[PDB]
Design an enzyme around this catalytic site. Structure first.
Site, PDB file in Angstrom:
ATOM      1  N   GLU A 133      -8.823 -11.118  -7.534  1.00  0.00           N
ATOM      2  CA  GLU A 133      -7.810 -10.090  -7.432  1.00  0.00           C
ATOM      3  C   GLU A 133      -6.725 -10.317  -8.459  1.00  0.00           C
ATOM      4  O   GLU A 133      -6.011  -9.383  -8.818  1.00  0.00           O
ATOM      5  CB  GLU A 133      -7.262 -10.008  -6.012  1.00  0.00           C
ATOM      6  CG  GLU A 133      -8.211  -9.216  -5.127  1.00  0.00           C
ATOM      7  CD  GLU A 133      -8.106  -9.549  -3.656  1.00  0.00           C
ATOM      8  OE1 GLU A 133      -6.982  -9.837  -3.205  1.00  0.00           O
ATOM      9  OE2 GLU A 133      -9.154  -9.494  -2.962  1.00  0.00           O
ATOM     10  N   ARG A 181      -1.499 -14.477   4.542  1.00  0.00           N
ATOM     11  CA  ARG A 181      -2.379 -13.848   5.533  1.00  0.00           C
ATOM     12  C   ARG A 181      -1.783 -13.922   6.945  1.00  0.00           C
ATOM     13  O   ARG A 181      -1.819 -12.934   7.686  1.00  0.00           O
ATOM     14  CB  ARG A 181      -3.797 -14.460   5.469  1.00  0.00           C
ATOM     15  CG  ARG A 181      -4.835 -13.911   6.452  1.00  0.00           C
ATOM     16  CD  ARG A 181      -4.870 -12.384   6.544  1.00  0.00           C
ATOM     17  NE  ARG A 181      -5.319 -11.724   5.318  1.00  0.00           N
ATOM     18  CZ  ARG A 181      -6.543 -11.236   5.124  1.00  0.00           C
ATOM     19  NH1 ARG A 181      -7.467 -11.331   6.072  1.00  0.00           N
ATOM     20  NH2 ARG A 181      -6.841 -10.646   3.975  1.00  0.00           N
ATOM     21  N   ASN A 233      -1.896   0.380   6.916  1.00  0.00           N
ATOM     22  CA  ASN A 233      -1.442  -0.971   7.276  1.00  0.00           C
ATOM     23  C   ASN A 233      -0.574  -1.678   6.227  1.00  0.00           C
ATOM     24  O   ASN A 233      -0.670  -2.892   6.033  1.00  0.00           O
ATOM     25  CB  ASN A 233      -2.615  -1.854   7.742  1.00  0.00           C
ATOM     26  CG  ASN A 233      -3.862  -1.670   6.902  1.00  0.00           C
ATOM     27  OD1 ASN A 233      -3.787  -1.305   5.728  1.00  0.00           O
ATOM     28  ND2 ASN A 233      -5.022  -1.917   7.502  1.00  0.00           N
ATOM     29  N   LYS A 266       0.835  -1.201   0.000  1.00  0.00           N
ATOM     30  CA  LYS A 266       0.000   0.000   0.000  1.00  0.00           C
ATOM     31  C   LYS A 266       0.880   1.267   0.000  1.00  0.00           C
ATOM     32  O   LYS A 266       2.062   1.146   0.275  1.00  0.00           O
ATOM     33  CB  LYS A 266      -0.957  -0.066   1.189  1.00  0.00           C
ATOM     34  CG  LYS A 266      -2.056  -1.115   1.039  1.00  0.00           C
ATOM     35  CD  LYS A 266      -2.854  -1.265   2.323  1.00  0.00           C
ATOM     36  CE  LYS A 266      -4.168  -1.997   2.101  1.00  0.00           C
ATOM     37  NZ  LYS A 266      -4.713  -2.572   3.366  1.00  0.00           N
ATOM     38  N   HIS A 291      -1.717  -5.201   1.184  1.00  0.00           N
ATOM     39  CA  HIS A 291      -2.958  -5.937   0.947  1.00  0.00           C
ATOM     40  C   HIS A 291      -2.664  -7.334   0.505  1.00  0.00           C
ATOM     41  O   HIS A 291      -2.022  -7.519  -0.514  1.00  0.00           O
ATOM     42  CB  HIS A 291      -3.811  -5.251  -0.117  1.00  0.00           C
ATOM     43  CG  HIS A 291      -4.830  -6.168  -0.757  1.00  0.00           C
ATOM     44  ND1 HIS A 291      -5.875  -6.674  -0.077  1.00  0.00           N
ATOM     45  CD2 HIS A 291      -4.921  -6.670  -2.051  1.00  0.00           C
ATOM     46  CE1 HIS A 291      -6.602  -7.458  -0.892  1.00  0.00           C
ATOM     47  NE2 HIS A 291      -6.017  -7.456  -2.100  1.00  0.00           N
ATOM     48  N   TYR A 306     -12.342  -2.984  -3.680  1.00  0.00           N
ATOM     49  CA  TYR A 306     -12.926  -2.943  -2.343  1.00  0.00           C
ATOM     50  C   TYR A 306     -14.445  -2.895  -2.405  1.00  0.00           C
ATOM     51  O   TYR A 306     -15.093  -2.299  -1.542  1.00  0.00           O
ATOM     52  CB  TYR A 306     -12.352  -1.787  -1.519  1.00  0.00           C
ATOM     53  CG  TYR A 306     -10.891  -1.950  -1.136  1.00  0.00           C
ATOM     54  CD1 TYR A 306     -10.480  -2.957  -0.257  1.00  0.00           C
ATOM     55  CD2 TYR A 306      -9.924  -1.083  -1.642  1.00  0.00           C
ATOM     56  CE1 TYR A 306      -9.141  -3.095   0.095  1.00  0.00           C
ATOM     57  CE2 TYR A 306      -8.587  -1.208  -1.298  1.00  0.00           C
ATOM     58  CZ  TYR A 306      -8.195  -2.208  -0.430  1.00  0.00           C
ATOM     59  OH  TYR A 306      -6.860  -2.310  -0.097  1.00  0.00           O
ATOM     60  N   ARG A 349       2.962  -6.150   9.449  1.00  0.00           N
ATOM     61  CA  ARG A 349       2.151  -5.034   9.957  1.00  0.00           C
ATOM     62  C   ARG A 349       2.403  -4.775  11.441  1.00  0.00           C
ATOM     63  O   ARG A 349       2.286  -3.643  11.911  1.00  0.00           O
ATOM     64  CB  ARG A 349       0.650  -5.291   9.741  1.00  0.00           C
ATOM     65  CG  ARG A 349       0.131  -5.215   8.310  1.00  0.00           C
ATOM     66  CD  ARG A 349      -1.380  -5.335   8.374  1.00  0.00           C
ATOM     67  NE  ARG A 349      -2.091  -5.127   7.111  1.00  0.00           N
ATOM     68  CZ  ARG A 349      -2.770  -6.069   6.455  1.00  0.00           C
ATOM     69  NH1 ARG A 349      -2.811  -7.319   6.913  1.00  0.00           N
ATOM     70  NH2 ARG A 349      -3.406  -5.762   5.330  1.00  0.00           N
ATOM     71  N   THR A 377      -5.297  -7.700  10.044  1.00  0.00           N
ATOM     72  CA  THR A 377      -5.577  -6.460   9.323  1.00  0.00           C
ATOM     73  C   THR A 377      -5.342  -5.223  10.196  1.00  0.00           C
ATOM     74  O   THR A 377      -4.802  -4.236   9.721  1.00  0.00           O
ATOM     75  CB  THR A 377      -7.011  -6.482   8.750  1.00  0.00           C
ATOM     76  OG1 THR A 377      -7.217  -7.703   8.025  1.00  0.00           O
ATOM     77  CG2 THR A 377      -7.254  -5.305   7.827  1.00  0.00           C
ATOM     78  N   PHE A 437     -16.204   4.265   6.446  1.00  0.00           N
ATOM     79  CA  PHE A 437     -14.763   4.510   6.247  1.00  0.00           C
ATOM     80  C   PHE A 437     -14.290   4.306   4.801  1.00  0.00           C
ATOM     81  O   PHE A 437     -13.096   4.447   4.495  1.00  0.00           O
ATOM     82  CB  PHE A 437     -13.925   3.647   7.198  1.00  0.00           C
ATOM     83  CG  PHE A 437     -13.900   2.178   6.843  1.00  0.00           C
ATOM     84  CD1 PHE A 437     -12.790   1.618   6.203  1.00  0.00           C
ATOM     85  CD2 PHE A 437     -14.975   1.346   7.171  1.00  0.00           C
ATOM     86  CE1 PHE A 437     -12.763   0.265   5.884  1.00  0.00           C
ATOM     87  CE2 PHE A 437     -14.955  -0.007   6.856  1.00  0.00           C
ATOM     88  CZ  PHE A 437     -13.848  -0.547   6.207  1.00  0.00           C
TER      89      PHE A 437
END
Lengths: 151, 151, 151, 151, 151, 151
Positions: A128, A87, A114, A11, A117, A51, A104, A93, A59
């Site tokens: 994705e 993950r 964070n 990100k 992704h 998303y 993270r 997250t 948000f």
């Protein structure tokens, strides 16, 4: 049969803070193979279909505008159960629930920034992959450590 | 007082992926006294006595065959709870369950390729040191920082 | 000439400041194959034949003592330009002249404590390999990425 | 001066040697900004067009062969003295002459598999990016430590 | 000569760019003993006096203004040739001239933002110590590993 | 909140094990801005007021002797959840139960030699800020990266 791929992408806040290398090494050191890799400013429309499930939350507008705010490293990676494993390798997250040693937990602090992704499921993996990547940009090839990675 | 001594042997993949320095660095900056070392091509006959506990199991020929596919650092560390503590450093035998921060979680993926081994207990350890190493191969010394590690 | 070997030793001060891991990693991450590795306190008797070329030097009395004072990580490294490149990786004999990026340049201060040895020639190397190690100790295999270090 | 650009590519030996993150990392940790980054198997006519200067060469067909025997990382990097300085990062053309702390000095033994290629001059740089990258791929953005990089 | 001290001060950009520890670790790993430290904002009558050799230079005001714009970590570093060694660990005045593995060569890019100061002479350090540090904030202790660093 | 400040003190074993660099660089990559950083061989009299609540315990004395057996590096780190998350960066008070990837987890072995100290509460941080520091030592500026670690 080692068939899973998983979309992995750093990100803006991580890339902005020289983390493209470490995250890249982390997967390389796990035993993960790269399939495709670029550096694109994800457009407002793209981040939104990305998303899509987070479209109805309050948000949401701040998330894509943050996610669009700069060029992102998009990637695919190869391992067995790579989606759950990435993950775990990413951490929770919210970088608060994630332990140090995960990325993270190591580099971010707040959920809004964070660092990365990584796909939440198989269903997420393929979607994705089709979204960020053209089919031909996923290069098939053999890693030289393969037999010492897989049985 | 003389301490627990583990037997940690780095597997053929571990050397082959070039983390002998990375691995030796861990038991080191932790505060452990390496008391014995060599790099060997472990004989199938030697290997068989190591996994003598399973000599009825089917993968046994493949294990001995793989464990001979490359060189091994046969190691001995010292420290209070070095057997369990090294296992703490190593992670769980299967690397997908291994927490990052560990040797297995940070560097590899697969269980048949879990980079390094350690005795599960003192009883296992004490057998494992005497088997792979001659008694004179075990270096008796005091580190210049024994007093700062130990009260 | 991928077959060429050298001899590194982390000297008594080298282990005692806990730098075995940092040293071993740098030789690893460069892309050399570790072939032989152990940890020993040399008997003054062994230190002697290693230094039999300087057995008649003024500092022979101290040099033996300095070498016998601690345990040592005895090593044999393999590959292209391993002799010349390795010594350069260690840097200058005097760490005061050793450059940033070097083991002595990054970690040490004095020639009396230069932390480390590296074979000054193939002649010294092969004599130093034969002197510390048996042939049944050199472990000959192949890196999964050797084809990527080597043409 | 600050907007000077350069072309750097890791060759096949690099990507297959799991060095990708390490090569990127010394530039980013240097503080040069990523402009454009892609993973590609360069075509026969392409590999020839980059070395069109070496068209009369006896090592040409084999150079084309190697540069195409594996995947390549074609990269762009921006900053003052990025052309001159980046070369210092890679080291000299012979890896045996590349100094400890440079890329080639840390990660390679031979010129024929020297892991990385660098722009040799300003004129060459714009030629190497304009050929390799499309205009739209070259990313415009600002690092959060620009004012802390530059006066 | 083992008792020499030097003044190393991490500059405002050094503070701001997340590097204070990495800097401390660099002397610490080399073999150097921390004598004294504080995190302060140096005053204009402080910096001008620190640099009174440069109080009349055409860049004198903006120099004091920059060095006053962020906090600095003043350090005092002990050891044999700690002055001569420390500048070398740091790199050259011009970070464009600073080589890999130095503080300026690894992190910075341009002289007006050169991240770190190092005492240039024994006279300059003891001036740079006495003007910057109080008599009592200068710690007298012996390191437990002194014997492993010196004779 | 965003403005919360925590106290960190690095132990005598900490300076001596060559780790202060590892400790600070860790908090920096986190997103944390250093507000204060000092160094001292502390008086027993000091170790008294910091450890006042235990003053009747049989384990008070050796404690004061140790925290006085070497120097101490006192820090004040700023950031959201600096007390709370920062402790997770340290690990559990007993480095034995502490997960690798943490500070006491990555370097310490025994709780009596536990390398560093982090605040346990809002309440202690503010007393410990009062104790190790005058108010004028705390420095007030902005990290060029704040807008990216935070929303």
């Amino acid at each position: 049969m080692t068939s899973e791929r998983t979309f992995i992408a750093v990100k803006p806040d991580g890339v902005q803070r020289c983390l493209v290398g470490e995250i890249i090494q982390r997967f390389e050191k796990k035993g993960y193979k790269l399939v495709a890799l670029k550096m694109l400013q994800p457009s407002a429309e793209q981040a939104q279909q990305h998303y899509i499930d987070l479209a109805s939350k309050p948000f949401y507008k701040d998330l894509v505008a943050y996610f669009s705010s700069g060029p992102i490293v998009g990637m695919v990676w190869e391992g067995k159960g790579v989606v759950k494993g990435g993950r775990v390798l990413l951490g929770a997250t919210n970088p608060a629930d994630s332990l140090p040693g995960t990325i993270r937990g190591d580099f971010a602090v707040d959920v809004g920034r964070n660092v990365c992704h990584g796909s939440d499921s198989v269903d997420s993996a393929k979607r994705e992959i089709a979204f960020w990547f053209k089919p031909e940009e996923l290069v098939n090839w053999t890693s030289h450590s393969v037999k010492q990675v897989y049985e």
